[PDB]
């Protein structure tokens, strides 16, 4: 009897052991009086997301119709300042609904002004209730010395936005590269901060091991980068000793130009004909899982349409990384295209013959002949369609001076449509473009330095890309 008793006792507690995890009401069916449409719960698509996986409808035909209608959202970032200040070296990065933004505020005329504050911060990109994607900044870091932080580049990863900056006590490390220490610093900001987060919200990461390969110094140089799993890739430039640079002048595109030398395309690789250092673009790879205090690895860009290292951007668009390189050299046609390989970096540059940028006296817009210069501005482009290779961005529709910012949508051999952001005689410089989906529509936010106060101040334009040219 007692054995049977025990069997029953075991039977019931073994069979009806039914503990369970908490119910997710948000991943369940709720039925209330006067209900809202159920539709489908599919989180992380409901807000701002990257342009990945969808064949979105955009107009793919050329038109003169005013179908692009930019909204001004400059009030979303702390660029109001005051009449006595000028804002320089803006950065704006976006990834998966989050952004990183930075600028340096200088007192008086910024070119010769005095730094007051270097601001680096992060936040969310969202519809804040005005039906226009806006930037909501909540997490702001300020260095103890605004005169040492240069050429910052941001990459989003796992709810943090990593910002890699150069540290220099000799001023701009490009102009004074022969006296630069080569020291870099990494800042990690939470995109969704916690109260009393401490190191969760703002953390300083030391970079004590830099793998430069054959380069003497390497530096971050570009608004933003990409993430591939556990590894961050920042846009960067390596500083090689000029005399170590291997280049065959016989491969210089002197064909059909009677006003150039085979030497010009090599000499232009520095910021002057006799620059000690020669600058070449590439990436700085930072592997977040490679132990503690992980090393930084420089990856140089392959020698296809090689030009001087310049601000560059690598971004994820429609399933694959796309690399953009500003032209500060004689090759003034827009230089961007698919990344075939990330390490080594090999880019399949697009044969774009309609987009270029203003230059000055030596390397003017649409110049394709080797010359000696270091001039031009960063006029970005973001890919919005892979089948027709449609890109969008703000370019300065000018020749000799940097002015007349226009937002345009284009193909390699055609400009489809445009909207002017400022009048023809309005001066402008650096433009950063980031496109994303909001409510399944393509929006692009362009940060444009526009001259006002007699200072330059960034403005942000939220542009919806139209389905049809009506």
């Amino acid at each position, epitope marked *: 009897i007692s054995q049977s008793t025990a069997s029953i006792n075991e039977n019931v507690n073994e069979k009806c052991k039914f503990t369970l995890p908490p119910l997710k009401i948000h991943e369940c069916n709720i039925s209330c009086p006067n209900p809202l449409p159920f539709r489908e719960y599919r989180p992380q*698509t409901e807000g701002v997301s990257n342009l990945v996986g969808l064949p*979105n*409808n955009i107009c793919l035909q050329k038109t003169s119709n005013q179908i692009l209608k930019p909204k001004l959202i400059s009030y979303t970032l702390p660029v109001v300042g005051q009449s006595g200040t000028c804002i320089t070296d803006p950065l704006l990065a976006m990834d998966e609904g989050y952004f990183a933004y930075s600028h340096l505020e200088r007192i008086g005329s910024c070119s010769r002004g005095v730094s007051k504050q270097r601001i680096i911060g992060v936040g969310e990109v969202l519809d804040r209730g005005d039906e226009v994607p806006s930037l909501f900044m909540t997490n702001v870091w300020t260095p103890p010395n605004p005169n040492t932080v240069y050429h910052c580049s941001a990459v989003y990863n796992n709810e943090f936005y990593y910002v890699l900056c150069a540290v220099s006590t000799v001023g701009d490390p490009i102009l004074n590269s022969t006296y630069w220490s080569g020291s870099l610093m990494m800042t990690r900001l939470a995109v969704k901060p916690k109260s009393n987060g401490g190191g969760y919200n703002q953390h300083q990461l030391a970079l004590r091991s830099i793998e430069k390969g054959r380069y003497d110094k390497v530096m971050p140089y570009g608004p933003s980068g990409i993430k591939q799993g556990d590894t961050l890739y920042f846009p960067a430039v390596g500083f090689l000793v000029r005399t170590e640079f291997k280049y065959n002048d016989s491969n210089c595109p002197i064909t059909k130009c009677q006003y150039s030398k085979p030497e010009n395309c090599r000499l232009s690789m520095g910021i002057r004909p006799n620059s000690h250092y020669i600058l070449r673009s590439g990436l700085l790879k930072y592997n977040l899982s490679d132990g503690e205090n992980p090393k930084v690895v420089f990856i140089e860009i392959s020698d296809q349409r090689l030009s001087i290292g310049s601000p560059s951007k690598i971004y994820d668009s429609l399933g694959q990384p796309v690399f953009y390189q500003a032209s500060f050299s004689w090759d003034t046609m827009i230089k961007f295209g698919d990344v075939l390989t990330v390490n080594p970096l090999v880019v399949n540059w697009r044969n774009n013959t309609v987009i270029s940028r203003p230059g000055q006296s030596q390397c003017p817009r649409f110049n394709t002949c080797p010359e000696i210069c270091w001039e031009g501005v960063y006029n970005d482009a973001f890919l919005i369609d*892979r089948i027709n290779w449609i890109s969008a961005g703000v370019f300065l529709d000018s020749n000799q001076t940097a002015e007349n910012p226009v937002f345009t949508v284009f193909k390699d051999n055609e400009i489809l449509y445009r909207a002017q952001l400022a009048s023809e005689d309005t001066n402008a410089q650096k433009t950063i473009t980031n496109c994303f989906l909001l409510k399944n529509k393509i929006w692009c936010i362009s940060l444009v330095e526009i001259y006002d106060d007699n200072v330059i101040r960034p403005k942000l334009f939220a542009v919806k890309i139209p389905e049809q040219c009506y």
Partner: antibody, heavy 117, light 110 residues
Framework: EVKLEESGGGLVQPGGSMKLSCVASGFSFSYYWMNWVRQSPEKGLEWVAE??????????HYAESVKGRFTISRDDSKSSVYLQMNNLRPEDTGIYYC??????????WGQGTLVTV | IVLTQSPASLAVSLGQRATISCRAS??????????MNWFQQKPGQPPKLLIY???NQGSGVPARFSGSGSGTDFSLNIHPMEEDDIAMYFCQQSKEVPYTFGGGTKLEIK
């Protein structure tokens, strides 16, 4: 220039097997989804199989008519897509095309390889 | 999702408009996008993407071709018709896997 080149075609009797191979060039193969589509006078274009990215754990999808008989796989280092077709039937006779999918659309097609059963 | 095309075969005089309709048994719409593609196949060639996402023009596809529709009602519009448009045209559903094609519409010139 984007190219997809199919091989491994030929004549195989019913109950046998064939392995098709698509060589991909001109693009970053490791970031795109690859598909096979077959063509015949009887069915026109019929989708056969899809292979997703490493980040998708190489997930696969098959048409019910080939599901359980065909295996689709990739070698990203070799920039290639393979289709292992076992237990072939007369029903499988037709031209097998290798395609590349860009944001859900079959934008690029190879020339196709003929499979006779 | 079953796709039915019509007319199964068209005979179109040059310079004239032709329309190839496609009936879906189920909506192909999601994410604000109608997932309907069209392909053009000529003898001796693989299928060429002609239109995608119902209305997107297509890579290297001239204005001669256009598409429209939503939900379950789609069409391919060719105008003016040219001799180089003799081809088989396929209607494709890409909303979900399995992906499906229509029977194929053959368009010739009269």
């Amino acid at each position: 220039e984007v190219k997809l080149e199919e091989s491994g075609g030929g004549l195989v009797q019913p109950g046998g097997s064939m392995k098709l191979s698509c060589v991909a060039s001109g693009f970053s193969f490791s970031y795109y989804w690859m598909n096979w589509v077959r063509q015949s006078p009887e069915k026109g274009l019929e989708w056969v199989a899809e292979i997703r990215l490493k980040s998708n754990n190489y997930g696969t999808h098959y048409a019910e008519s080939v599901k359980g008989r065909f295996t689709i796989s990739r070698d990203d280092s070799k920039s290639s897509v393979y289709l292992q077709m076992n237990n072939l039937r007369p029903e499988d006779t037709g031209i097998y095309y290798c395609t590349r999918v860009i944001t859900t659309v079959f934008a690029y097609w190879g020339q196709g390889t003929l499979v006779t059963v | 999702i079953v796709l039915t095309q019509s007319p199964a075969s068209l005979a179109v005089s040059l310079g004239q408009r032709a329309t190839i309709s496609c009936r879906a048994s189920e909506s192909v719409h999601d994410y604000g996008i109608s997932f309907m593609n069209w392909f053009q196949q000529k003898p001796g060639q693989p299928p060429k993407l002609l239109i995608y996402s119902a209305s997107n023009q297509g890579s290297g596809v001239p204005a001669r071709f256009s598409g429209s529709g939503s939900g379950t009602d789609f069409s391919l519009n060719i105008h003016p018709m040219e001799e180089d448009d003799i081809a088989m045209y396929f209607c494709q559903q890409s909303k979900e896997v399995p992906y499906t094609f229509g029977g194929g519409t053959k368009l010739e010139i009269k």
